[PDB]
Amino acid sequence: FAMQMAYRFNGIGVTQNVLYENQKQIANQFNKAISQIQESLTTTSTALGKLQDVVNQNAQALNTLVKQLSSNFGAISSVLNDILSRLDKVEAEVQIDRLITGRLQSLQTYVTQQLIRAAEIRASANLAATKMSECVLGQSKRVDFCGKGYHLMSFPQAAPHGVVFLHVTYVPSQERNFTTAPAICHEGKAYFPREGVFVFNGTSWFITQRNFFSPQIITTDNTFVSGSCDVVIGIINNTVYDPL
Amino acid sequence: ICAQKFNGLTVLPPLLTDDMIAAYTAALVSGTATAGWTFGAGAALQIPFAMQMAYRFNGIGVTQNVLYENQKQIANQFNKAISQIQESLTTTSTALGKLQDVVNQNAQALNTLVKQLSSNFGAISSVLNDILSRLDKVEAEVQIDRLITGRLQSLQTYVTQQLIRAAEIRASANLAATKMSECVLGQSKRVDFCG
Amino acid sequence: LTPSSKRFQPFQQFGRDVSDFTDSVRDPKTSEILDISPCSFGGVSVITPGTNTSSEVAVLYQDVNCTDVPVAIHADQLVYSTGNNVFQTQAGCLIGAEHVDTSYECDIPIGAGICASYHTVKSIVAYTMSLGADSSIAYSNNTIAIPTNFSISITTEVMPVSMAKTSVDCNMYICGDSTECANLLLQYGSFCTQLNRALSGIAVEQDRNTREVFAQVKQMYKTPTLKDFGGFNFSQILPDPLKTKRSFIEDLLFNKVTLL
Amino acid sequence: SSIAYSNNTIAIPTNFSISITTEVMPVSMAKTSVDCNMYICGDSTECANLLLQYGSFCTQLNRALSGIAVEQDRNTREVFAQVKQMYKTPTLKDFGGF
């Protein structure tokens, strides 16, 4: 699992040494977040407001359908027994037709509403299947698709008529301001960073990742040359240490 | 519109006025210009626009030296393209053909619903006043039932069409939300998704 | 009845509109054209914090310019009509709610960017919606903010996957147990047969939805006995062998939702 | 178009251009509302009494319309309200020549 999380960190532009040095902190944060969601779920909440909403929708639809029988639909009465016991056959045919047409219309309305609701639920189910494929069985590079922040992994959980996804995300914090340069001019040629950006802590110029402050000396392996110093704006003179 | 108002047909105003949506879009553009993609993934971190565009170039397999050497050309192309789209939008065009189409669809649906009252639905007349002033209560019951059934059917048809149109618009709105998440708040690797 | 400027033909006695609504009439004795409008006028809406909380409510007239369109020939006033606590919302007049300059989140939407809520002061208060937490962002051509630490955030996403499968009967619903009604219903064709076909399609689609969402692993991987993987405690999201087959979070979720 | 396939030749670009394309997406539709009696009947007491006998048809129609309206409001809110902070519009609106 440690190496899996190391690869997942690499997948979001963070070197794996970060995880191997802060494994205890990351595990503690994982556990604290899990406990937080546990307590959030146990306290009366609308977390499952969509699932209860669909349950209530179905119950209300059935209740309306059954209560629609009480309506007489403009006939002598809403009950067939009294119509048949009061009115003879030929005359009662009109009342029977009225009630049958009304009840058929009620059934058709219910079926159409159910079809539309089923279409909506199918759309939601397809989205859930895509989320399972992309967030759970892999790491998603899509923004905000598998949770707010940078996606690391996800865990599914069942629920009445639905699925709850626990998305684990890496959110940066404790920002620091730095002064940077598009490139560094050295012996008349401009060095650009292979990865990350140049920064200046106030003592010297370093190279660091965009997603985490891990300052490193500027060398030739993490920088590449292109052109001269007279073509880029913001270039600042400095030396590039050579391991030789 | 006056007939619609006199027949119980009304249009509720939207919750967010145009000014609030414009404020939202201005905030999104300012965030993109200043903090780049980061403001969508959590905290907003400032970045010079040149460096942000260098990273965005790197995101498509082009080294960042290209931008730092051709910044003038890239900025000029940006501005020229913006002016071109400006003029394209100002010259009478069907660019907004979907939005006008939905507006026209709603207007036509309401007009059809209100005009459906003129039909007498096989009864003595399409007006309740003359039926009630001509035919006594017991005989008038049949005509009233006919008209009520017809008008209820018209209402149900309108409601079903509105529900289906709302489903289609919800699909479009979900796609728009996904596009905002993936193209605006970040750089998208999907082909032909964001242009 | 009100006076009108409508132009009537010399012989005309009444006139209507596209919807066959008699919006004008001639006075037979004075021969003056009178327009006639409905009484409801359309659009009155009521805003209530809940009878359980309080019986105080507010009234919104959708398009009135804060006037007495609901003709005041009723006791009380309909909560009031053109009282003192009147607010002129864009496309509406709202009465019974106090307007406060401070803007908050939306609780009971009204419209045009105006929302109302049952704040304490206890009364109904109307205000303009709050878009978000204003932020100050400084743009610099030679400075960037980089993060120095990170946190792990676990977020929940609830997704409906299936709906209740329902089935209906032709006669048991339309008729019941009446032979004559069944005979009369036979003459209407194959309506309920197609209704049954649609319902069966919906039920099969629901089963397919659940199966496709969940049945994505061809192998039922065994639950590990050791549920700590380098300090990561998974025991909350994996089943407990002692118990029954669900994990603790699954049990909480099933308990949270309440399933004539 | 004429496309020639070669086992030992590759075509690589030497310049690039910036293209700005427009995509128009409907997000919401007009919110409508209807009245039972004023449409079916109008102001006729007898017609209202007759309509009462049909049950809860127009009640469910009103429920459907309200659902559609609130769904439209949610559509707009979810599409647009994706930033928690209302970033201030800069006075300097040129960013490296853009």
Numbering used by the authors:
A (entry chain A): 881 to 1124
B (entry chain B): 833 to 1027
C (entry chain A): 539 to 616, 622 to 664, 673 to 794, 796 to 811, 832
D (entry chain B): 686 to 783
Excerpt from the publication:
The coronavirus spike glycoprotein, S, forms homotrimers embedded in the membrane envelope of the virion. The mature S protein comprises two subunits, S1 and S2, generated by post-translational cleavage of a precursor polypeptide. The receptor-binding subunit S1 is variable in sequence and associates closely with the more conserved membrane fusion subunit S2. Intersubunit interactions influence the conformational states and dynamics of both subunits, regulating exposure of the RBDs in S1, their engagement with cellular receptors, and subsequent entry-related rearrangements in S1 and S2 that drive membrane fusion between viral and cellular membranes.
We performed cryo-electron microscopy (cryo-EM) studies to define the interactions made by residue 835 in the WT SHC014-CoV spike. Extracted particles were subjected to two-dimensional (2D) classification, which resulted in class averages populated with fully closed trimers, wherein all three RBDs are in the ‘down’ position. A 3.1-Å–resolution 3D reconstruction of the WT SHC014-CoV spike trimer was obtained and found to resemble that of the closed SARS-CoV-2 spike, which was expected given the ≈80% sequence identity between the proteins. The flexibility of the NTD led to poorly resolved regions of the map for this domain, preventing the modeling of some loops based on our reconstruction. C–terminal FPPR residues were resolved (residues 832–840), affording an examination of residue A835 and its local environment. A835 is part of an α-helix proximal to the FP, and it lies at the interface between protomers (buried surface area upon oligomerization: 22.7%). The A835 sidechain is pointed inward toward V946 in the S2 heptad repeat 1 (HR1) of the same protomer and toward residues D555, V556 and S557 in the S1 subdomain I (SD1) of the neighboring protomer. Residues 555–557 in SD1 connect A835 to the RBD in the neighboring protomer. We propose that the introduction of a negatively charged residue at position 835 decreases the stability of the spike trimer by disrupting a network of hydrophobic interactions within (A835–V963) and between protomers (A835–V556) and triggering unfavorable electrostatic interactions between protomers by virtue of its close proximity to an electronegative surface region in the neighboring protomer. In the WT spike, F294 is located near the C–terminus of the NTD, and is coordinated by contacts with K266 and K288 in the adjacent NTD-RBD linker to form a ‘double-cation-pi’ sandwich.
